[PDB]
Amino acid sequence: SSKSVANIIRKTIQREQNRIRMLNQGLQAVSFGQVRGVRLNVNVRESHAI
Amino acid sequence: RHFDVARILVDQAVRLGVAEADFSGLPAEWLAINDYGAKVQAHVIDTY
Amino acid sequence: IERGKFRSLTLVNWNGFFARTFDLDELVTTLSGGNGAGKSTTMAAFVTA
Ligand SMILES: Nc1ncnc2c1ncn2[C@@H]1O[C@H](COP(=O)(O)OP(=O)(O)OP(=O)(O)O)[C@@H](O)[C@H]1O
């Protein structure tokens, strides 16, 4: 049961990572003050990967 | 109208290069730019 | 009588201000510039001093 839980979590995490990273390319360099762009950083956490 | 000119003029001038003296640590003086007591503080703009 | 006055505010080696002295007015001083121009930074320098 624990193995199945871990596997499903990994699959869902990968799917959401891919979706968000693909979505990131939907922004086109907004020029606000000195900020030249905005981006989302999604990464599986190592403290949880362990 | 003088004020409304000065501001605008400065806005146009500061887009053109920088002033190298601003790194010298020597404050600039308040040069009078008309009668009635109007003054301006800016180093010469050298580095375009 | 003759209230004391802040006559100036000097930042040295601050972010964007290597050596900048502002001459505070006796009544009102007005920093003015677009976003990121560094006005809250100047007021932070004053407060920190
Ligand atoms: N703690 C900080 N670390 C890094 N950069 C900072 C920090 N605080 C401010 N900055 C940057 O310094 C520049 C000036 O910041 P500041 O807050 O002084 O802007 P400002 O001109 O007062 O802005 P606004 O008019 O929009 O309030 C901006 O690029 C801001 O991103």
Q: Which residue from B14, B10, B7, B12 is spatially nearest to B47, judged by alpha carbons?
A: B14
Structure tokens belonging to residue B43: 């180093």
In order of A13, A24, A35, B20, the CA distances from A29 in angstroms are 27, 11, 9, 32
Q: CA–CA separation, A43 vs C16, rounded Å?
A: 33
Q: Which residue from B27, B23, B40 is spatially nearest to C10, judged by alpha carbons?
A: B27
Q: Which residue from C33, B18, C41, C20 is spatially nearest to A33, judged by alpha carbons?
A: C33
Q: Which residues pair with B37 in a beta bridge?
A: none
Instruction: Provide the terminal-to-terminal Cα distance of chain A, rounded to the nearest Å.
Output: 18
Quickly list DSSP for C9-44: EEEEEETTEEEEEE---SS------STTSSSHHHHH
- Give the resolution to one decimal, in Å: 3.1
Burial class (CB in 10 A: 0-12, 13-18, 19+), A6: exposed
Q: CA–CA separation, C22 vs C30, rounded Å?
A: 11
E-only strand ranges, chain A: none
Residues of C with Cβ-Cβ distance to B30 under 8 angstroms: 23
Of B23, B27, B30, the CB nearest to C21: B27
**Interface residue B41 vs chain C (CB under 8 A):** yes
CB B10 within 8 A of CB B3: no
CB B47 within 8 A of CB B17: yes
Contacts of B14 (CB under 8 A, 6+ apart): B45
Give the position, in ligand 1's atom list, of the atom nearest the Cα of C35. 26
Which residues line the pocket of ligand 1, CB cutoff 6 A? A 33-34; C 15, 33, 35-41
Q: CA–CA separation, B24 vs C30, rounded Å?
A: 24
Structure tokens belonging to residue B19: 């002033």
What is the CA B37 to chain-centroid distance, rounded? 16
Distance A23 CA to ligand 1 centre (A): 29
Structure tokens belonging to residue A39: 């981006």
Nearest CA of chain C to the CA of B25: how many Å? 6
Are 3 or more Cβ–Cβ pairs between C and A shorter than 8 Å? Answer: yes
| C10-13 contacts at long range (C-beta below 8 A, 24 or more positions apart) | C11/C42, C11/C45
Q: CA–CA separation, A3 vs A49, rounded Å?
A: 14
Give the 3-state secondary structure of residue A10. helix
Nearest CA of chain C to the CA of B10: how many Å? 12
